[PDB]
């Protein structure tokens, strides 16, 4: 049995989803909840200055990611609720890696921390809020957030960029809401809520709105709230239909390169001045689902706002063996291939390699020929 007191924390990697936001698109009905732009006001406690570069980098890329909704607020925007969620996540990280053990400096140190986010604004602001919470708005040096162009982006499954992935999922994506039991429930929900059959709606849009409204405690349609759990379950069912656990090639192409990044970071520990103690990645629900599945930890719930997957790397001070410990939303996990929560690094990497994709192999697998 391993004595944890002989375990020394080496590297931490945290992947997270942005905080609560406004829905991407509203439900098609006359009476909608009011989304007030007042929700956009930044809590002063969360203010942290930062700049954005490409992976180089190097100039920041242009962002393709327009819709104004009832109340005047824009779609897909991070609210003060989400800002507070992320700040809270940062404070949990501070509790773990700063206070309880002095692994990280209490003030932000550019050389201790590598920061990457998708080029979307709500992720960037979520990152700022997390940093604000973790470091209590203290920096010894400027905060730099690295992002990539949307076409190269590996932080979410990229269908636009990866042709084979698109081709492998296209049929199922077309028919996803027509599947048995998904279709009946969808019709049932649209009917009970008085949504027209002439409006095109699926469990993704439903879940988007119910989760956004519940997160903000808004005066939602009581029937929508009543269906919340089945709506979430059916969204999950739809997502898994489009990309099932059994389709390995698709998973590889979906999260494979991201996994490859996490693995690379683990490997930097095997071997100076370029060493980071903390790696942060701002990502999306669509990243989390297949990610969790490949790690064999998926709980069949939509990944929540501000959810995080935290990966700790330890080295035993006596044996000099290495171990990985994985948490999801603050709860300890046992990834597949692992004897238990404290997983020998070699077993962990061997397990992860089932789905891992290097840039070369990704590019090859994705291309038409």
Swiss-Prot record:
Entry protein name: Lysophosphatidic acid phosphatase type 6
Function according to Swiss-Prot or TrEMBL: Hydrolyzes lysophosphatidic acid (LPA) containing a medium length fatty acid chain to the corresponding monoacylglycerol. Has highest activity with lysophosphatidic acid containing myristate (C14:0), monounsaturated oleate (C18:1) or palmitate (C16:0), and lower activity with C18:0 and C6:0 lysophosphatidic acid.
Gene encoding the protein: ACP6
Active site: 18 (nucleophile), 285 (proton donor)
Organism of derivation: Homo sapiens (Human)
Enzyme class: hydrolase
Annotated GO biological process: hematopoietic progenitor cell differentiation; lysobisphosphatidic acid metabolic process; phosphatidic acid biosynthetic process; phospholipid metabolic process
Catalytic activity entry: a phosphate monoester + H2O = an alcohol + phosphate; 1-(9Z-octadecenoyl)-sn-glycero-3-phosphate + H2O = 1-(9Z-octadecenoyl)-sn-glycerol + phosphate
Main subcellular location: mitochondrion
GO molecular function, one term: lysophosphatidic acid phosphatase activity
Effect of residue 65 to F: Decreases enzyme activity
Statement: the UniProt record of this protein carries the keyword Lipid metabolism: yes
Effect of residue 239 to W: Decreases activity toward substrates with medium and long aliphatic chains, but not toward substrates with short aliphatic chains
């Amino acid at each position: 049995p391993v004595d944890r007191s002989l375990l020394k924390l080496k590297m931490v990697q945290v992947v997270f989803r942005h905080g609560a936001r406004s829905p991407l698109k509203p439900l098609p009905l006359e009476e909608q909840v009011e989304w007030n732009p007042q929700l956009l006001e930044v809590p002063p406690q969360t203010q942290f200055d930062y700049t954005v570069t490409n992976l180089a980098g190097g100039p920041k890329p242009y962002s393709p990611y327009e819709t104004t909704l009832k109340g005047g607020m824009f779609a897909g925007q991070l609210t003060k609720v989400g800002m507070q969620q992320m700040f809270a996540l940062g404070e949990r990280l501070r509790k773990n890696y700063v206070e309880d053990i002095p692994f990280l400096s209490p003030t932000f140190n550019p050389q201790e921390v590598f920061i990457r986010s998708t080029n979307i604004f709500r992720n960037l602001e979520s990152t700022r809020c997390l940093l604000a919470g973790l470091f209590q708005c203290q920096k010894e040096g400027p905060i730099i957030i690295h992002t990539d162009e949307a076409d190269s982006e590996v932080l979410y499954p990229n269908y636009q960029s990866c042709w084979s992935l698109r081709q492998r999922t296209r049929g199922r994506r077309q028919t996803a809401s027509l599947q048995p039991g998904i279709s009946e429930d969808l019709k049932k929900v649209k009917d009970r809520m008085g949504i027209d059959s002439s409006d095109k709606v699926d469990f993704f849009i439903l879940l988007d709105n119910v989760a956004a409204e519940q997160a903000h405690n808004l005066p939602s349609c009581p029937m929508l709230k009543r269906f919340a759990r089945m709506i979430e379950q059916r969204a999950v069912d739809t997502s898994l239909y489009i990309l099932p656990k059994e389709d390995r090639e698709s998973l590889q192409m979906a999260v494979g390169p991201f996994l490859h990044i996490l693995e690379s970071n683990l490997l930097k520990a095997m071997d100076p001045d370029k060493i980071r103690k903390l790696y942060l990645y701002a990502a999306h629900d669509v990243t989390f689902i297949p990610l969790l599945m490949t790690l064999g930890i998926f709980d069949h719930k939509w990944p929540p706002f501000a959810v995080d997957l935290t990966m700790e790397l330890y080295q035993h001070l006596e044996s000099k063996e290495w171990f990985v410990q994985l948490y999801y939303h603050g709860k300890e996990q046992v990834p597949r291939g692992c004897p238990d929560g404290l997983c020998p690094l070699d077993m962990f990497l061997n397990a992860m390699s089932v789905y891992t994709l290097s840039p070369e192999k990704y590019h090859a697998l994705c291309s038409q020929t």
